[PDB]
Design a protein around this ligand. Sequence first.
Ligand code: SF4
Ligand SMILES: [Zn+2]
Ligand SMILES: [Zn+2]
Ligand SMILES: [Zn+2]
Lengths: 335, 698
Amino acid sequence: IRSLILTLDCSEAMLEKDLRPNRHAMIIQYAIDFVHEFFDQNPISQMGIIIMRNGLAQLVSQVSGNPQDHIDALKSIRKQEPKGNPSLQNALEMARGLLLPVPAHCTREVLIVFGSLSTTDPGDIHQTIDSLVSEKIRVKVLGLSAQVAICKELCKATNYGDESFYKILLDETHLKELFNEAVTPXXXXXXXXXXXXXXXXXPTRIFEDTPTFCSCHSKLVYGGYFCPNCHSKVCSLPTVCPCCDLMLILXXXXXXXXXXXXXXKTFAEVPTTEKFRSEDCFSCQSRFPXXXXXXXXXXXXXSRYRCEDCKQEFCVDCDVFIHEILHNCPGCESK
Amino acid sequence: YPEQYNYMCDIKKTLDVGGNSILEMPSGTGKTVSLLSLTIAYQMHYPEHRKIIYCSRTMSEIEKALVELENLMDYRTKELGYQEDFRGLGLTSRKNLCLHPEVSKERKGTVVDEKCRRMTNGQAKRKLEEVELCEYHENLYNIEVEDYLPKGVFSFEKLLKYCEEKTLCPYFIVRRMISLCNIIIYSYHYLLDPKIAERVSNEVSKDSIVIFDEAHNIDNVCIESLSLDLTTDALRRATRGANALDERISEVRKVDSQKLQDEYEKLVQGLXXXXXXXXXXXXXXXXXXXXXXXXXXXXXXXXXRAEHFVSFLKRLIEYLKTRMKVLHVISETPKSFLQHLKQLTFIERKPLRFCSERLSLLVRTLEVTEVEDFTALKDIATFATLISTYEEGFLLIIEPYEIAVPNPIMRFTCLDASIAIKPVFERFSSVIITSGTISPLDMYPRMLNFKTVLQKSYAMTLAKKSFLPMIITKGSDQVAISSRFEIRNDPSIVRNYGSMLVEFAKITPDGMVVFFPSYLYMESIVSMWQTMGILDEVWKHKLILVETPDAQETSLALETYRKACSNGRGAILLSVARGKVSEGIDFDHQYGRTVLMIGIPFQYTESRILKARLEFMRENYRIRENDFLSFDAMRHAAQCLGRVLRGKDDYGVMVLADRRFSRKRSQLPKWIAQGLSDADLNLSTDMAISNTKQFLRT
Ligand code: SF4
Ligand SMILES: [Zn+2]
Ligand SMILES: [Zn+2]
Ligand SMILES: [Zn+2]
């Protein structure tokens, strides 16, 4: 569904001592964690890692849905020293070369981790910006410390003229938060066009391994997925079958679809003196006063959470928990 | 916005009551206030009563006033849907408002008015007894051209293109449209010009509102109205000019002497008044401002002709050569110099009336006039008009001999500036005086005596977006003392200061503009700096304003700055606060987000002019040895402070060195004094806080 291109800054400016021990190692590690979370909340999505080193853009992880390739590609960067200077234009041109074969019904995202305060580009970057906006490519830049006007014009131009995507990071925790923000999709207002895709297989799991089989690598396996079209037994991933080009999805597509469908209804905070109901939680059992800062003014007040779709009481930890995972409110299942 | 609305109320009450007001506007947010306040103030009375007389110091402010005036026209025409009599006349440079010198001359010098006088004389000569007319003429005085402006705004650029399309000349359109009483946007060198202020004063016909914009260099303009340096070469040009006058005497006495006798009779009968009342569209000469001079009944050399004027003129220039060939140090009192001249030869105190008339007579007898000789005759004529009149505060001075070859110079020192500004307080009223680089605003009631009201800036909010720190400790506190001398001392300490500039420029690579008190430090650090990594890592290239500034060089440096900042590169702008181009166009990240100041501004001392004006102001206001090292430097530093402020939506930081800055005020007096190394990390945090508070305060 999504096609994100992770462009990490790997130049001499990354050798400075801001993060611990340096910016490069923390960006690599947090990039590995970003690969984990991204492939955990986006199963049938694509990733591609490019680095900006030695004044050039170097593709280190081809566009694929297997996280292990990105993990190894990120492990190879921390064993070398980030030298040279960053090149935004070359990275955006190569990102274009990786996002052009992507179908129009799939989003094209480019996430740039920019630590330096200056880039080294051959040609005019504004023409590359015009090319990015023309072919519809959403660009998000996580810059370090001071702002760059080119990043403002790029993030604003690549998002329907709206500026709210050039995120400034000031610490490791902030960078973690931005990473987390790139996991979640962005249902923007769009420009109203047509959408649909067709042909998505569902596999049958083969447990046989006495003679083994493989139609994508011709190697030994312990069992493999079955294509309902070309009838090939390949390595197991819910992505595209490489023998006739169609998906092999299962309950994962339903999972991410329902995750994108979650309304996440925050329960209204109503004091016990206003609800006139005993302290109760419907997901567990709560006899704990929430408020008690003062004497009888706060202890006898407390806070009861309310789901209005069923008029039920809950405590805060369960509102947070059902906001993180699970469908909202067990009381909405009983009528 | 309420802050600017308070200034709107102040402009309203001062326009309705007071005759003059000293209004202090915040830098970057006070240009669009008076432009609408004046128009609405004109509409509340009745549509056509007083007119906007906006006065700026540069042409960029004139263009900004023109485009903002167009924003006023669109603003008033998009909210009501009714079309009114449009105003707005752009009075710019003569070379930039003419089309013929770009077709054949291909020059942008100051002699375009001479060629325009050749074309005008061609028109007059093809309308009298006979070069071509020009490009297009004889239709610039008609009603249609007089109505092309009130029906549609055509100012400067729109007037240049409109004249290039409609086949017209913009000079006569503007000149004929000064009497139309539109919104004229000219500079201070035109309101107080000993050659332009007379005609403008006769065409505007007074009864308007004058707007002194950025009125902080008014004393500088009043000083620049005189002081002409006689550097021995003007004596040779005056000698060759006298020889040319003798040749012209032989020519008019050779065959055609009837016109000289007829014009001579016009002088004996109707004098200078009739001579200037008969001629129309003829080139004029210089004059010590006739409205300020007030001298009538100009007799033509005690009723004499031209041979006597060139004889007494040869004696006068020879006396000048005699007074310029002396020992070395000598000061002149203009009265004692006139008395000594009378002791050498009697000529009385009337060579002024003898120049203003004889120059016009020669013009009326000349058809092929040489430019250098006539120019030298105009210089000697001005010197005569200013040794014959205007003596109170005037001080003739001779430059000492310092080798003695490059030396014979004679400069005249002007008089009190209050005299020069004076006529506007009888011609006009409710003259609004606005400036964003005035602090304190008490040196304008003191120096230049006039009764007015004082209104200071009352706008100060969002202090977290206007980082204003100052640097005192440079790691050793040894460059802040050596950077205050007229001549630099200990070059190694200056090299250490430059190294501190390399470290500071490396810490904050996001557009840097550095201002220097003089070009000596720049030329000393640019010769051999022992370092260049800032140009090799963060700045790619450096921008240096030449000690001899050039228009195309400065333009290519500014465009290079905008393109360098629009490519994510940045460049250090090593400029001088005392140099050319004070700038004023910001409101963008293309300008230097961080501005560096090398100490405090300094004025060149050990000069006879600073001692003459020093003792003169000492006798006037008794502000001796105190205001010439804090007021002028305060204005020069405020010229750099005004570039940092560019609206509350933008941010910036300006680093001022030296502790002496605490002795002077500043715009937005919220400053913290700490070291420079600490200011590196402080600015490192400000470059993120300024980026975080934006979306939080919105
Ligand atoms: S009429 Fe106009 S174009 Fe011709 S010389 Fe005069 S100013 Fe220039
Ligand atoms: Zn298949
Ligand atoms: Zn609970
Ligand atoms: Zn519910």
